[PDB]
Protein backbone atom coordinates (compact mmCIF):
# COMPACT_ATOMS: atom_id res chain seq x y z
CA UNK A 1 0.00 0.00 0.00
CA UNK A 2 1.08 3.56 -0.56
CA UNK A 3 0.73 5.61 2.62
CA UNK A 4 0.61 9.43 2.72
CA UNK A 5 1.84 11.23 5.85
CA UNK A 6 -1.02 13.54 6.80
CA UNK A 7 -1.62 11.29 9.78
CA UNK A 8 0.81 9.07 11.77
CA UNK A 9 1.68 5.99 9.70
CA UNK A 10 0.24 3.42 12.11
CA UNK A 11 -0.17 -0.22 11.08
CA UNK A 12 -1.41 -3.36 12.78
CA UNK A 13 1.27 -5.87 13.74
CA UNK A 14 0.98 -9.36 15.15
CA UNK A 15 3.78 -10.54 17.39
CA UNK A 16 4.00 -13.37 19.94
CA UNK A 17 0.29 -14.07 19.38
CA UNK A 18 -0.73 -10.48 20.28
CA UNK A 19 -2.14 -7.69 18.05
CA UNK A 20 -0.76 -4.17 18.44
CA UNK A 21 -0.56 -0.92 16.54
CA UNK A 22 2.91 0.42 15.58
CA UNK A 23 4.41 3.39 13.81
CA UNK A 24 6.36 2.84 10.54
CA UNK A 25 9.37 4.98 11.51
CA UNK A 26 12.08 5.78 8.93
CA UNK A 27 14.04 7.70 11.54
CA UNK A 28 14.56 4.66 13.76
CA UNK A 29 17.37 2.26 13.05
CA UNK A 30 15.79 -0.32 15.32
CA UNK A 31 12.36 -1.66 16.33
CA UNK A 32 11.18 -0.99 19.89
CA UNK A 33 8.01 -2.35 21.43
CA UNK A 34 6.44 -1.78 24.82
CA UNK A 35 6.67 -4.49 27.49
CA UNK A 36 5.73 -8.04 26.49
CA UNK A 37 7.53 -11.37 26.74
CA UNK A 38 9.34 -13.09 23.90
CA UNK A 39 11.19 -16.37 23.10
CA UNK A 40 14.91 -17.00 23.36
CA UNK A 41 17.69 -15.28 25.27
CA UNK A 42 17.93 -11.50 25.60
CA UNK A 43 20.73 -9.02 26.24
CA UNK A 44 20.66 -5.54 27.87
CA UNK A 45 21.09 -2.67 25.42
CA UNK A 46 20.85 1.14 25.48
CA UNK A 47 19.21 3.25 22.79
CA UNK A 48 19.57 6.91 21.87
CA UNK A 49 17.30 9.71 20.71
CA UNK A 50 15.91 13.15 21.58
CA UNK A 51 13.87 12.94 24.80
CA UNK A 52 16.56 4.20 27.42
CA UNK A 53 16.97 0.80 29.09
CA UNK A 54 15.86 -1.96 26.75
CA UNK A 55 16.11 -5.71 26.45
CA UNK A 56 17.10 -6.97 23.00
CA UNK A 57 15.61 -10.14 21.44
CA UNK A 58 16.76 -11.66 18.18
CA UNK A 59 15.09 -13.63 15.37
CA UNK A 60 11.64 -12.47 16.53
CA UNK A 61 8.74 -13.00 14.10
CA UNK A 62 6.56 -9.96 13.48
CA UNK A 63 3.77 -9.59 10.99
CA UNK A 64 3.46 -5.96 9.91
CA UNK A 65 0.35 -4.97 8.04
CA UNK A 66 0.36 -8.53 6.65
CA UNK A 67 4.00 -8.85 5.66
CA UNK A 68 6.04 -11.24 7.81
CA UNK A 69 9.56 -10.23 8.89
CA UNK A 70 12.00 -11.74 11.41
CA UNK A 71 14.56 -9.79 13.31
CA UNK A 72 15.74 -8.03 16.32
CA UNK A 73 13.14 -6.43 18.45
CA UNK A 74 13.87 -4.24 21.46
CA UNK A 75 11.48 -4.25 24.37
CA UNK A 76 11.52 -1.30 26.72
CA UNK A 77 9.55 1.59 28.28
CA UNK A 78 8.65 3.27 24.98
CA UNK A 79 5.46 5.36 24.72
CA UNK A 80 4.78 3.77 21.31
CA UNK A 81 5.56 0.66 19.34
CA UNK A 82 8.14 1.67 16.67
CA UNK A 83 8.88 -0.36 13.59
CA UNK A 84 12.40 0.70 12.50
CA UNK A 85 14.53 0.22 9.40
CA UNK A 86 15.82 -3.20 10.34
CA UNK A 87 12.26 -4.51 9.71
CA UNK A 88 11.07 -1.88 7.17
CA UNK A 89 13.68 -3.10 4.66
CA UNK A 90 12.34 -6.63 5.17
CA UNK A 91 8.91 -5.70 4.01
CA UNK A 92 10.23 -3.77 1.03
CA UNK A 93 9.31 -0.37 2.37
CA UNK A 94 10.62 2.75 0.57
CA UNK A 95 10.17 6.53 0.84
CA UNK A 96 9.13 8.30 -2.32
CA UNK A 97 8.75 11.97 -3.22
CA UNK B 1 13.44 10.01 -5.83
CA UNK B 2 12.60 6.63 -4.39
CA UNK B 3 14.69 5.91 -1.30
CA UNK B 4 15.24 2.43 0.17
CA UNK B 5 15.91 2.08 3.91
CA UNK B 6 19.09 0.02 4.10
CA UNK B 7 20.84 3.15 5.30
CA UNK B 8 19.49 6.20 7.21
CA UNK B 9 17.40 8.34 4.86
CA UNK B 10 19.56 11.47 5.07
CA UNK B 11 19.02 14.38 2.68
CA UNK B 12 20.60 17.78 2.22
CA UNK B 13 18.50 20.74 3.34
CA UNK B 14 19.08 24.45 2.98
CA UNK B 15 17.65 26.67 5.67
CA UNK B 16 18.42 30.26 6.71
CA UNK B 17 21.27 30.31 4.17
CA UNK B 18 22.97 27.24 5.74
CA UNK B 19 23.38 23.69 4.35
CA UNK B 20 22.75 20.74 6.66
CA UNK B 21 21.98 17.04 6.50
CA UNK B 22 18.64 15.82 7.97
CA UNK B 23 16.79 12.57 8.44
CA UNK B 24 13.44 12.04 6.64
CA UNK B 25 11.54 10.76 9.68
CA UNK B 26 8.01 9.33 9.30
CA UNK B 27 7.81 8.75 13.04
CA UNK B 28 8.13 12.44 13.89
CA UNK B 29 5.11 14.67 13.81
CA UNK B 30 7.32 17.75 13.83
CA UNK B 31 10.64 19.00 12.43
CA UNK B 32 13.48 19.60 14.89
CA UNK B 33 16.83 21.10 14.02
CA UNK B 34 19.92 21.70 16.12
CA UNK B 35 20.76 25.22 17.29
CA UNK B 36 20.71 28.02 14.71
CA UNK B 37 18.93 31.36 14.53
CA UNK B 38 15.78 32.06 12.55
CA UNK B 39 13.45 34.97 11.59
CA UNK B 40 10.29 36.04 13.39
CA UNK B 41 9.02 35.47 16.91
CA UNK B 42 9.37 32.14 18.72
CA UNK B 43 7.52 30.39 21.54
CA UNK B 44 8.75 27.80 24.09
CA UNK B 45 7.48 24.28 23.47
CA UNK B 46 8.11 20.77 24.84
CA UNK B 47 8.42 17.64 22.72
CA UNK B 48 8.04 13.97 23.56
CA UNK B 49 9.72 10.71 22.59
CA UNK B 50 11.70 7.73 23.89
CA UNK B 51 15.03 8.93 25.33
CA UNK B 52 13.09 18.24 25.41
CA UNK B 53 13.21 22.05 25.63
CA UNK B 54 12.72 23.58 22.20
CA UNK B 55 11.97 26.95 20.67
CA UNK B 56 9.28 26.90 17.98
CA UNK B 57 9.47 29.07 14.83
CA UNK B 58 6.70 29.36 12.26
CA UNK B 59 6.55 29.93 8.49
CA UNK B 60 10.23 28.94 8.14
CA UNK B 61 11.48 28.21 4.61
CA UNK B 62 13.38 24.96 4.20
CA UNK B 63 14.60 23.38 1.01
CA UNK B 64 14.71 19.60 1.38
CA UNK B 65 16.58 17.65 -1.24
CA UNK B 66 15.51 20.41 -3.67
CA UNK B 67 11.85 20.71 -2.78
CA UNK B 68 10.90 23.93 -0.98
CA UNK B 69 8.49 23.78 1.98
CA UNK B 70 7.47 26.37 4.59
CA UNK B 71 6.40 25.56 8.08
CA UNK B 72 7.05 25.20 11.68
CA UNK B 73 10.51 24.27 12.67
CA UNK B 74 11.59 23.47 16.22
CA UNK B 75 15.09 24.33 17.32
CA UNK B 76 16.52 22.51 20.29
CA UNK B 77 19.29 20.23 21.64
CA UNK B 78 18.62 17.34 19.24
CA UNK B 79 21.47 14.99 18.26
CA UNK B 80 20.21 15.09 14.65
CA UNK B 81 18.24 17.29 12.31
CA UNK B 82 14.80 15.62 11.87
CA UNK B 83 12.43 16.40 9.06
CA UNK B 84 8.96 15.38 10.34
CA UNK B 85 5.55 14.87 8.78
CA UNK B 86 4.54 18.52 8.86
CA UNK B 87 7.16 19.10 6.11
CA UNK B 88 7.22 15.60 4.53
CA UNK B 89 3.60 16.05 3.39
CA UNK B 90 4.63 19.35 1.80
CA UNK B 91 7.12 17.70 -0.45
CA UNK B 92 4.71 14.94 -1.41
CA UNK B 93 6.52 12.22 0.47
CA UNK B 94 4.83 8.80 0.89
CA UNK B 95 5.75 5.38 2.31
CA UNK B 96 5.28 2.45 -0.01
CA UNK B 97 5.54 -1.31 0.48
C1 LIG C 1 13.07 5.11 18.55
C2 LIG C 1 14.57 5.16 18.68
C3 LIG C 1 15.19 3.81 18.39
C4 LIG C 1 15.17 6.19 17.69
N5 LIG C 1 16.63 6.23 17.81
C6 LIG C 1 17.51 5.82 16.90
O7 LIG C 1 17.29 5.29 15.78
C8 LIG C 1 18.98 6.12 17.33
C9 LIG C 1 19.73 7.13 16.55
N10 LIG C 1 19.80 5.13 17.18
C11 LIG C 1 20.11 4.35 18.18
O12 LIG C 1 19.71 4.41 19.40
O13 LIG C 1 21.11 3.26 17.79
C14 LIG C 1 21.97 2.70 18.75
C15 LIG C 1 23.13 3.55 19.23
C16 LIG C 1 23.26 3.77 20.65
C17 LIG C 1 24.34 4.58 21.17
C18 LIG C 1 25.30 5.16 20.25
C19 LIG C 1 25.16 4.92 18.80
C20 LIG C 1 24.06 4.10 18.27
C21 LIG C 1 14.63 7.63 17.84
O22 LIG C 1 14.60 8.10 18.94
N23 LIG C 1 14.23 8.22 16.73
C24 LIG C 1 13.65 9.54 16.38
C25 LIG C 1 14.45 10.74 16.06
C26 LIG C 1 15.87 10.84 16.35
C27 LIG C 1 16.90 10.46 15.35
C28 LIG C 1 18.32 10.55 15.62
C29 LIG C 1 18.60 11.04 16.94
C30 LIG C 1 17.56 11.41 17.90
C31 LIG C 1 16.14 11.32 17.65
C32 LIG C 1 12.48 9.25 15.45
O33 LIG C 1 12.74 8.63 14.24
C1 LIG D 1 11.82 13.68 17.08
C2 LIG D 1 10.60 13.85 17.94
C3 LIG D 1 9.78 15.04 17.50
C4 LIG D 1 9.71 12.59 17.85
N5 LIG D 1 8.50 12.75 18.68
C6 LIG D 1 7.25 12.87 18.25
O7 LIG D 1 6.83 12.91 17.06
C8 LIG D 1 6.23 12.91 19.41
C9 LIG D 1 5.30 11.77 19.56
N10 LIG D 1 5.34 13.86 19.33
C11 LIG D 1 5.49 14.98 19.97
O12 LIG D 1 6.44 15.35 20.75
O13 LIG D 1 4.31 15.94 19.74
C14 LIG D 1 3.98 16.91 20.71
C15 LIG D 1 3.31 16.43 21.97
C16 LIG D 1 3.92 16.77 23.24
C17 LIG D 1 3.33 16.34 24.49
C18 LIG D 1 2.10 15.56 24.45
C19 LIG D 1 1.48 15.22 23.16
C20 LIG D 1 2.09 15.66 21.89
C21 LIG D 1 10.40 11.26 18.24
O22 LIG D 1 11.00 11.24 19.27
N23 LIG D 1 10.25 10.26 17.40
C24 LIG D 1 10.71 8.85 17.34
C25 LIG D 1 10.00 7.70 17.93
C26 LIG D 1 8.92 7.88 18.91
C27 LIG D 1 7.50 7.95 18.48
C28 LIG D 1 6.42 8.12 19.43
C29 LIG D 1 6.87 8.20 20.78
C30 LIG D 1 8.29 8.12 21.16
C31 LIG D 1 9.39 7.95 20.24
C32 LIG D 1 11.24 8.64 15.92
O33 LIG D 1 10.36 8.78 14.87
| Phi/psi at A89 (5° precision) | -65, -30
Spatial separation of the C-alpha atoms in residues B86 and B89, rounded to whole Å: 6
Kindly report the protein residue whose alpha carbon is nearest to atom 18 of ligand 2: B48
CB atoms within 10 A of CB A21: 11
Query: Is beta strand B67-75 parallel, antiparallel or unpaired with respect to B32-33?
Result: parallel
Spatial separation of the C-alpha atoms in residues A6 and B90, rounded to whole Å: 10
Q: What 3 state SS string does A41-52 have? A: CEEEEECCCCCC
Alpha-carbon distance A30 to nearest alpha carbon in chain B (angstroms):
11
The technique is: X-ray
| Phi/psi at A90 (5° precision) | -70, -25
Q: Write the burial class of residue B47 (CB in 10 Å: 0-12 exposed, 13-18 middle, 19+ buried).
A: middle
CB A42 within 8 A of CB A85: no
* Nearest CB to B93 within list A24, A93, A96: A96
Q: Write the burial class of residue A63 (CB in 10 Å: 0-12 exposed, 13-18 middle, 19+ buried).
A: middle
Ligand 2 atom closest to Cα of B26? 33
Active site residue B25: yes
CA of A40 to the centre of ligand 2 (A): 31
CATH code for the domain of A87: 2.40.70.10
Q: Name the helix (H) or strand (E) containing A88.
A: helix A85-88
Residues touching ligand 1 (Cβ under 6 Å) are A 25, 27-30, 32, 47-50, 82; B 23, 25, 27-28, 49-51, 78-80, 82
Between the alpha carbon of residue B13 and those of residues A12, B18, B23, the distances in Å are: 33, 8, 10
CB atoms within 10 A of CB A73: 29
- State the total domains in chain B: 1
Helix (H, G, I), strand (E, B) or coil at B85: helix
CB atoms within 10 A of CB A18: 10
Spatial separation of the C-alpha atoms in residues A75 and A36, rounded to whole Å: 7
The angstrom resolution of this structure is 2.0
CB A84 within 8 A of CB A32: yes
Give the number of A-B residue pairs with CB atoms closer than 8 Å. 134
Selection from B23, B27, B49 nearest residue B95 by Cα:
B27
The string over B57-88, giving b where at least 16 C-beta atoms fall within 10 Å of a residue's C-beta and e elsewhere, is beebebebbeeebebebbbbebebbbbbbbbb
B65 φ/ψ sector (left φ>0, alpha ψ -120 to 50, else beta)? left
Residues in CB range of B55: below 8 A, 6 or more apart: B42, B43, B44, B45, B74, B75, B76
Selection from A13, A87, A76, A70 nearest residue A49 by Cα:
A76
What is the residue range of A20's domain? Answer: 1-97
Amino acid sequence: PQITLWKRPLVTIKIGGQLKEALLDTGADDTVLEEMNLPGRWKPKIIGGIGIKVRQYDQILIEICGHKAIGTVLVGPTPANIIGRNLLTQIGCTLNF
